[PDB]
Amino acid sequence: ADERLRINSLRVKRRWRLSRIVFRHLADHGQLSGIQRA
Amino acid sequence: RELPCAWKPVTYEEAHAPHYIAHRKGWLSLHTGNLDGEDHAAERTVEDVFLRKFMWGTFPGCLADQLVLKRRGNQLEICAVVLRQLSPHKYYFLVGYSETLLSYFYKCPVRLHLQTVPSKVVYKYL
Amino acid sequence: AALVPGVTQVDNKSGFLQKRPHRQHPGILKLPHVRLPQALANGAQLLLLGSAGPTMENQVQTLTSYLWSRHLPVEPEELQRRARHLEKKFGAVLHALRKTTYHWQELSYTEGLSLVYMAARLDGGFAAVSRAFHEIRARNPAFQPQTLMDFGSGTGSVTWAAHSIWGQSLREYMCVDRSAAMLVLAEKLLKGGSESGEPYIPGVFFRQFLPVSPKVQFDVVVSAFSLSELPSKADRTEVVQTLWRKTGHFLVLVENGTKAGHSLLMDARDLVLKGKEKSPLDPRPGFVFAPCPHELPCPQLTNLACSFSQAYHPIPFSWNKKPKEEKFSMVILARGSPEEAHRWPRITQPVLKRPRHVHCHLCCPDGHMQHAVLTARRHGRDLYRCARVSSWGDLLPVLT
RNA sequence: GGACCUGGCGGUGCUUCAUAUCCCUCUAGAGGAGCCUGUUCUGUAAUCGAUAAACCCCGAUCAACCUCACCACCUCUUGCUCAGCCUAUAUACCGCCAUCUUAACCCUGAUGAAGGCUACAAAGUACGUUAGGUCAAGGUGUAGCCCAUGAGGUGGCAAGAAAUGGGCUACAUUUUCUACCCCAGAAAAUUUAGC
């Protein structure tokens, strides 16, 4: 990370880390905290 | 012959539809991570996924209804509801095993709160 | 297996490779994007001017998908065996027999439904028949038919297609169709879409039943997308026997490029090849001119289908914007014996061009399918280049 | 053969109305101009090709001597690593889209088939289918090639016509420029959508 940054300096539901289908499945069951569908 | 002659019980969580999650139903897992400004929501969700799989696999056919995964501070309370089919010795052994396994899994003080019921508590029928 | 690496070579008769490039090799039977004659195109739109609104959008789409997905009528013999299995597992069987079974209906083409068909299949039908005819013209340019018959002449697409190729020799176009509406609709189309006029193509004879005379044989007999309309296998067998008995040179049968369409044509193919008439008026035998390189049973009749595609320009309409493709199954039966013994494999699937190798699915003269991956070093520069330019429906000129 | 009962009419026409989808009604475009372009045809030994991979140096933009694909000549090999391959198969399966098929009781009729309502009330109450598409925001397998479907060198490959579809620009007097953020001064028919 540091090494690659140094040279450069000189010059879907990824929010929850779930598959987009799965987030629906979890949220419908009420499993996610505070995710109420409206 | 010729062509012309031819020509379920549901529990409370199961019974109610998803659009009652804040009207009639509740939330199984309760954590602050998803709130505004709070972090690590995805981490908590991944922990919940594994925890539910591991409970359902460590108590096969025993859980009467879904878990309740509460978290206060670093605590992790699994308030589960199971049946009275297994022997109490097996329940105690599984409680100890799963508690220790999860406490060393997440490096946090996990705990179990098994609640035995005689049978599935059916709400209605669909 | 007609492609043995290092053994099979290209067939050079008439000094092909020396005197012509590879893209024009004799097995190239690809036809450019088919455009219908302006007279036919103009007439179709004129006849539809009465009603070409949003209602016809759904009707044309509904009819097209129905015909494509239509299955063959279920014979009683297949029905009893299915009934017994459900009986063993179990009026209830009949209810389960309503499902898991296709409900085949007669399509009674009245005036209204004949317009929907014409706007849905005139362009597609013309291209498929044109491709089938091009097979005869390309391989046997000396053939000059003088007579033609069309069993199931719905919109005259066969008549128009034949005129496009053999218009300078054909003198009679025998048309048969039980629906009076189609005969009226076709007759109007030949007169510029007007009930009063002069026919564009001369010598057309519209009928409702087959000719009766035993001693009349039409040089080219055609049946395109018509044998799927018959209610039972008994009628299909009788019609094909009648058609073959009246076939002078060539019998062309075309159907949809589905499993149902392919299965239907195979039954007709074996029917003609296995002659049963003890002493027919015409004693000449029959052989498959195309698309099969053999008379042995089909290698894809088990699970798959054998279809060919022809891209064409549809008639300008409110819903015909981009070019379309007509997937169809065909079989041409010719009187006599095969012209030579150097018959060539037929490509029955799209050719996939990839870096330095070509995928070709071939039907070989030996009666087996060979998925040959052709490359320059294994098979040679000439043969690889020939397959590089070849396409679906062509012949690969290989020998030994 | 007489009389009667239930019908069904896969019913057929009219009459009255509910008569919403869809027309008509309203608003703004599109027909002009200049470009790039998709398709189709024809051409060459060759491919017209593709830049999470070139060039740029206001904005953009063409080949670039690029590069992968292609044509013609060749070369490397036990080599990278028991190597390597942007090969095939959903015509292997799932995943996802689309096609089509599809109760009891009580009264009446002489205890006959059968029938049972009047409110100022007269018996009525209780899944399959498909040579389907999609392997670009998803997976599990199956086969191919392995002195070549792997790795490289040399050169070559430049394309034209219409008919149609789309995209990008400016298009003004109810405009434009300055000061201000609204009392100032100067300039000059078809057809697609929506509500």
Ligand SMILES: C[S@@+](CC[C@H](N)C(=O)[O-])C[C@H]1O[C@@H](n2cnc3c(N)ncnc32)[C@H](O)[C@@H]1O
């Ligand atoms: C839809 S047309 C075929 C399509 C047409 N050849 C085309 O250009 O695509 C099929 C016709 O076959 C006719 N037909 C059905 N049974 C028949 C029979 N037994 N004898 C003669 N014609 C028949 C029907 O009247 C129908 O119009």
Ligand code: SF4
């Ligand atoms: S697979 Fe071969 S034999 Fe069968 S129909 Fe097609 S060409 Fe004929």
Ligand SMILES: [Mg+2]
């Ligand atoms: Mg498929």
Ligand SMILES: [Mg+2]
């Ligand atoms: Mg070029």
